[PDB]
Amino acid sequence: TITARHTQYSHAKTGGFSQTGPTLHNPYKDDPILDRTLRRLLPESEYMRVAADLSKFGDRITSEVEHLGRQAELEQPRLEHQDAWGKRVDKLIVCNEWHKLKQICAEEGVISIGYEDSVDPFVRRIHQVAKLFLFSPSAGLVSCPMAMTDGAVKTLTSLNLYGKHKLATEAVDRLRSRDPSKAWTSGQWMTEKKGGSDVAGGCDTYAVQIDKDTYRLHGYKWFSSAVDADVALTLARIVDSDGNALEGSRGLSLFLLKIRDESGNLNGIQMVRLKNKLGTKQLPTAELLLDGAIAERIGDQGRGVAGISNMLNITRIHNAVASLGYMRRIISLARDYSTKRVVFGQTQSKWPLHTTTLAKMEVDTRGSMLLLFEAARLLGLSEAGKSSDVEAMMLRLITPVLKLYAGKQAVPMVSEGIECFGGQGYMEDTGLPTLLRDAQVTPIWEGTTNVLSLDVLRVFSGKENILLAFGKRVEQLLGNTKTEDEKLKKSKEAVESALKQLQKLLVKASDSAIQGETRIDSVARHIAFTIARIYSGALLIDHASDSSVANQSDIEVAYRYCCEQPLIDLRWEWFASERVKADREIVFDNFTA
Amino acid sequence: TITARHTQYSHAKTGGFSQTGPTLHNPYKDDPILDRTLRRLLPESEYMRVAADLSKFGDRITSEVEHLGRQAELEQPRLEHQDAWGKRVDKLIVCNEWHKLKQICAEEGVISIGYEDSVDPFVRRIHQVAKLFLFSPSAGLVSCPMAMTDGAVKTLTSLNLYGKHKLATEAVDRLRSRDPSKAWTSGQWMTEKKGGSDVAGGCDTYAVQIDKDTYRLHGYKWFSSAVDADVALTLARIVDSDGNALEGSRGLSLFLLKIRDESGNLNGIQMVRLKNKLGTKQLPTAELLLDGAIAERIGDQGRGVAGISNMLNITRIHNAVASLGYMRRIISLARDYSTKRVVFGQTQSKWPLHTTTLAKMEVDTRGSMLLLFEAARLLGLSEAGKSSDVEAMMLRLITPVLKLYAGKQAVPMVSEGIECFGGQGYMEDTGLPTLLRDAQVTPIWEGTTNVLSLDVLRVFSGKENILLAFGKRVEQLLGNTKTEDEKLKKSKEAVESALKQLQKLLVKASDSAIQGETRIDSVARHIAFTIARIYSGALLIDHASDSSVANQSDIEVAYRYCCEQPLIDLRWEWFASERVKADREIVFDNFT
Amino acid sequence: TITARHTQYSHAKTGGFSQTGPTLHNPYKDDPILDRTLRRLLPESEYMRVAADLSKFGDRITSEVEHLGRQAELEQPRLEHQDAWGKRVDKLIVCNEWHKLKQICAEEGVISIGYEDSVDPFVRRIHQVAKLFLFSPSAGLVSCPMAMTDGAVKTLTSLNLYGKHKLATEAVDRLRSRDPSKAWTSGQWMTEKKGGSDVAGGCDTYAVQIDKDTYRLHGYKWFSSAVDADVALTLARIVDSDGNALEGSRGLSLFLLKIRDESGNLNGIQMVRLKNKLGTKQLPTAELLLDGAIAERIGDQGRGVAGISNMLNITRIHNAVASLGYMRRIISLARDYSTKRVVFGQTQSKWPLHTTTLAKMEVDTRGSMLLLFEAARLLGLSEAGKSSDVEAMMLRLITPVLKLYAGKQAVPMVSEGIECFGGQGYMEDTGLPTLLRDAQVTPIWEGTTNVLSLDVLRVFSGKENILLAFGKRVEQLLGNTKTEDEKLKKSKEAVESALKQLQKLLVKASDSAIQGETRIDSVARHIAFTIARIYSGALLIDHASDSSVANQSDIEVAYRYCCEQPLIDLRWEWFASERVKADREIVFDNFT
């Protein structure tokens, strides 16, 4: 009979308060412009169908995909070179959610949709891009094999192999399949140690003929993402019968291989290690040593870079989607959080300074958003055989410009976004820093900002009059400006003036370069930034002029995008070659030689 | 007898090539502007002493500290609530290299130099900040307790407690010590669940009087870094004899406590958990449950906020140091890499696009670097009693401005830097991403960009003196311009034009009728950025114009900073209340 | 044009050789004695049903479960106190394969089979234990909640609560279900800091009446496994209306609770931490702080201990299953390996020393295996109402004996087994060490070897009936001996001689004068081992003597078990009180 001690067992008191975090709303319904943009680009019959599918998928993002993608971050891939008995197996361990995510992509047709023969090509790419844009920031980086997979189908089909070449026909069918138990994905192994940007100088993989169009590959692939994929595309240097190869782009042939034989065993490949990455941690990225890998030559010998170009538009568009996804997502989470976090006696949402900051992020995102859907429209026209000459040229211009500009927007924007949450933004267990770490891949891979900026110049250097064509496209967009609204008129005038300046500078540049004292490369980024802003601005304007869909916000946005920041930031003197000498004196001041 | 099988055992061949990564060079010698800046600011005999100490420390950084900081990232702090036998212990497990870093801070006087009696305060804060600046990007986040440590010293001293108050006097003395065996660090525990930033409205810790000036604390600290520190400052509401307290700022009193007791046992504190952080992973940051932690009140009752205000200038300066450290570091690594990485047949260093990219990063860095040293200058003066009115006012203005601007430059700059490395910049095992993850703390803690922008507005609202003095300071800097140089001249004009326009807009927004339709808080960031750019611009001109040290890069950077990006980005129509409504519509379009 | 470099990219060569590891064969078909034992014990039509179900499950074990169990070791449970936003949640993170294992338990009726109304209880517990035995070494410790689950069913039923008590009836029904979507598991939270084993003196949990039969619990559970269960049984002291309670066994009442509420939220419970365990790493074991956990009292007030006593037989049987599972498993793997590993020019299987080592392990395993099935037999009989006096008494005696003996055989046996593999037996990635680390739980939990040895003594002290009945049971087994066989005959004699000597020593120790100078607790283990060996011996003889099933190995094993190691290791002089003094001196020599 002692005194009871119930009182001596008691949970810790912590004050009662804890902050409610942000809510992810249905990302199709909650998106500011996506639905409206679709109202305008698609025909009525197709809009209903597409909206319904996307809106439903929105609900799957919130109830299922988000959680899956999160788990893929929490349970990262591993590699075991060996089993326990001394046997080399290169076992890749990836979590169930990654696999489930690949299956949802199949079921949801994230690839299929972009190729469905019963649907108009222009419709389907716009549907697909909208779907990828809902998926991407919840994807746990399954978005990356989706991109390479789309790019693979694209490449194999542009080379006219589907129906004719055994493995490519099978690949195409499987890569496009909506059957989760049949569907394939693809990798893409271009980057090597000596160069990634530079494939003609970097690639030291060699192909020895076994028989006919079947070769052995031997080389080292320095980044190879999604090694759980079923097939891959890669470049290599065919070895002629005297044991020799060609340097440069002219040495490179293109090959398709199955990653694993029918026994589940690696096909002449050893995984040297998995990368330890700032972000995309969900994604297994390996270094590969090829040593006898059996592969099939596709496309013409020495025509390897040409072969894979066929997919540029694709991959880059997907990359842009990712960038934009991160941007939209942080805004979406931020603004929601803004209705719940009390500071100095009211919700963040009430403080002018807070809304100013977010509004500017909105403005910039909308611009690029519409640039993205222009790209998707254009790709689709091109795939239908219905491109005007101008639309064909715009497709070639817009893709690198889009990838690099959205690319460069993304980290600063997402960085600003997480700061909206204060300290919480910085805590990995909220899910928010993932968005930053993963966003930062987007300006780096598939071409850095500056390498793509050169690609933009190389688009110009090819020469049907890209620039004139750029001019006409802009003019079309400006032609139905609601000039009666004072702000849209001013906007139209800003875009117009900027276009006119850019033309003048590039005309000037083009003349002066034989004289030696002019280096257009040096300002390639500013050039590419300018095109993006002009193009994006024109689209916002056209968008805000459709009063069947436009609201007031659309008008404010067009105005702010066009007139409250420079459309062109580019000066003649930055072209001067002397400028380059000044550049290096600055950079290399006191550098220890 | 059998055929040998030496051929069957063979390492893998992987092609012979692998890329040389970047070299970290002596960061005092390699820095493009730090030596020249010190040359101008210090009298020659102090410069010589200071340079030699830093040059040497540069070597210690490449030979030792860098590696130490890297290891503190590779071996992150852990926390164990219980020992194995049911005992609550809260064991904080932190790697040896963290500890070693703390001792190097003592050995190298990273705190001491700033308070050395026998050196002039001017000299000494310049020297200190320079040293803090070399240290910071190699510190594995030991930079953070150093900041909190310096702030603690400043706070304790400014309250006139040295000599009088036993614990604060022991604290000051140990926080400043060069003896690794004795030196102390401090934490600072303000932030709680309901508010960081907003401490007046978010602080829900309570202090019950034990005897005279000794209290027990009960509350929950939501972020508390360097829980391996020895002392900490913190705020709490004293509970009266009806068992009641005061809401708002007026309730809060400031307290000093020892973290652990003579026994190594936590003083009424539990560690609930360590934070899982994007960056500053080296640094142990915990949540703390205070339940009878024994603490000495310092400063006056209900004057807790004022009390810790004395340390702002210093904390903020340290923060800016961090930002700039990352900026300088990435540029330094990248430039080096650029002489080693071949792309299309040449090293990156020969591609104009690549150096265009870098030059612009350099330009912006230098502007802020000088801004940093002007703050250091102004702080040292303040502490010597020699400040003019102008200079006293500039210390108040520059500190929040500097922190927020450098803070907001840092992530986009470091992001661009890691992109110079291509895919390798994205690999954690290079050490490069750490720079970015760690840089991202800087615009967030100790006030977000926008919160500090509001502070900037408080500094000058509605006190016309502050901006006129900014005016005067700018003119002092510009009056030295080598106007013979066309670029410096245009530069000067640009600064003039911008300063003017700024002053006009703020006068106009001050108009007591204009105000109904006018929200200046809305553009607080633009305002603060403009101040930043104008100040920094002017400082770059002054620097370029000193012929005893400047070179041609100096002129060129000054020209670019001032004339090739707007110094003022601020329009009258952005002050309109109506605009706010438009902002909201844009932001909450389709919001569900 | 350049010279190709295909020769410069080449995998490493490592000599061509690597050892084939062991194969897990269908563990029902491969088992040397399980099928024959079932053949003898079950009527043919039940055997046929049972074998087919097990044979099939054998395949499911090699094709699926094994891999699942391995994964539950590779992906250990984790616990998160807080979510990211300051909320206390106690999230238990356990791998998919654990969950999958639990569903296979439901699908395969690992609990259901033991309670199936339409099958005879005799049959069904034999079938169940057989199934438990195939499952156990592949279960990734899901075996543990299965034991606690079966014990819960038995307890709830034996208290005559099925039909009457709402929660217990729902519980019983869900614990027995084959529907993965509905099936439940149970925990059992007895052990506290002051005592496991000693619950009467160590339980410091308190139950305050809410209403009628519903109470709130406040206390600290020091070990609580399978916190992913749905319900749990536990003991606590009811607090009276003076706010007082009863020390000792009499205070304790037994309670039934739901672990989480309709919302998935813990019922007044926090998880303080998960244990870091030598083995059973698959299994989530936590320490629990009960603070207002809502619970239904079941059984009578102060009858908590009696209440849970009904489940001992069953829990103990499950434990022995585990021990034997590990023993069988290692032997099975090792023998296989032995047909694949060449040492000095032959497979290990051809080296007599190697097979001598294994034979002795086999001999001992089989003895205990039969002991296990005799327990199963006796349990099923008890539950059918058909037990003779002898058989009722043998159930009580055999259960602690079986658990402790198998428990003490297991680590040294599995240790010898892993040594058969040489260095590979010491490698975690083979899966083999898991066997040893997991086996080591078995002599420790649910009573240590010595604590259960004291229970064995309680079973028979001072109740002369129990040993006479052991006597009778042994004679029943021996009366069937094929005495025509010289080995079985000698065997029989050995058992006789030993049983006799045992009975004499215990009579002698019972002498009320002898007792002053006599400590029987001192030799409790020897006593219990002797009972074990005698019982098992006799069972091996009986088995060997059934010509319809036995083979020559059976005879030989029986002979070796009985005649090649002492069945009794127990001398009269070890009972002496004086001896105790000598024991202490030896043990505490130079103790400081």
Ligand SMILES: Cc1cc2nc3c(=O)[nH]c(=O)nc-3n(C[C@H](O)[C@H](O)[C@H](O)COP(=O)(O)OP(=O)(O)OC[C@H]3O[C@@H](n4cnc5c(N)ncnc54)[C@H](O)[C@@H]3O)c2cc1C
């Ligand atoms: C790694 C780390 C370690 C830390 N360590 C410590 C430590 O040791 N000690 C300590 O005291 N603190 C520490 N902190 C606290 C840090 O200072 C806070 O996180 C900071 O106050 C940011 O605010 P918050 O976290 O309370 O978020 P909140 O202030 O809730 O939200 C910030 C957001 O609200 C906005 N906002 C707030 N007020 C206004 C306004 N009036 N007008 C417009 N917008 C507004 C901001 O602009 C920002 O977007 C740490 C933080 C981090 C990330």
Ligand SMILES: Cc1cc2nc3c(=O)[nH]c(=O)nc-3n(C[C@H](O)[C@H](O)[C@H](O)COP(=O)(O)OP(=O)(O)OC[C@H]3O[C@@H](n4cnc5c(N)ncnc54)[C@H](O)[C@@H]3O)c2cc1C
């Ligand atoms: C997470 C991740 C996953 C990846 N997965 C894959 C994959 O599955 N398959 C694959 O093939 N690749 C993959 N990559 C590789 C990626 O495409 C390369 O990183 C990219 O090609 C850049 O190449 P690099 O890393 O060699 O950069 P480098 O080109 O060595 O360096 C880039 C820097 O050099 C500058 N530069 C380069 N050329 C020029 C020039 N001509 N003029 C001026 N400046 C120039 C760039 O602007 C940039 O600053 C991956 C990368 C990452 C980060």
Ligand SMILES: Cc1cc2nc3c(=O)[nH]c(=O)nc-3n(C[C@H](O)[C@H](O)[C@H](O)COP(=O)(O)OP(=O)(O)OC[C@H]3O[C@@H](n4cnc5c(N)ncnc54)[C@H](O)[C@@H]3O)c2cc1C
């Ligand atoms: C992995 C694991 C999980 C567990 N999970 C649970 C669970 O879910 N629920 C639960 O209730 N319990 C659980 N237990 C508790 C387990 O039954 C106890 O650990 C057990 O009671 C052993 O005793 P103890 O831990 O209290 O040690 P103690 O009993 O303090 O010490 C045991 C030692 O004392 C000796 N000893 C004790 N009494 C005597 C005596 N009278 N004479 C001579 N020697 C004596 C024993 O022989 C032994 O040497 C778990 C244990 C483990 C290891």
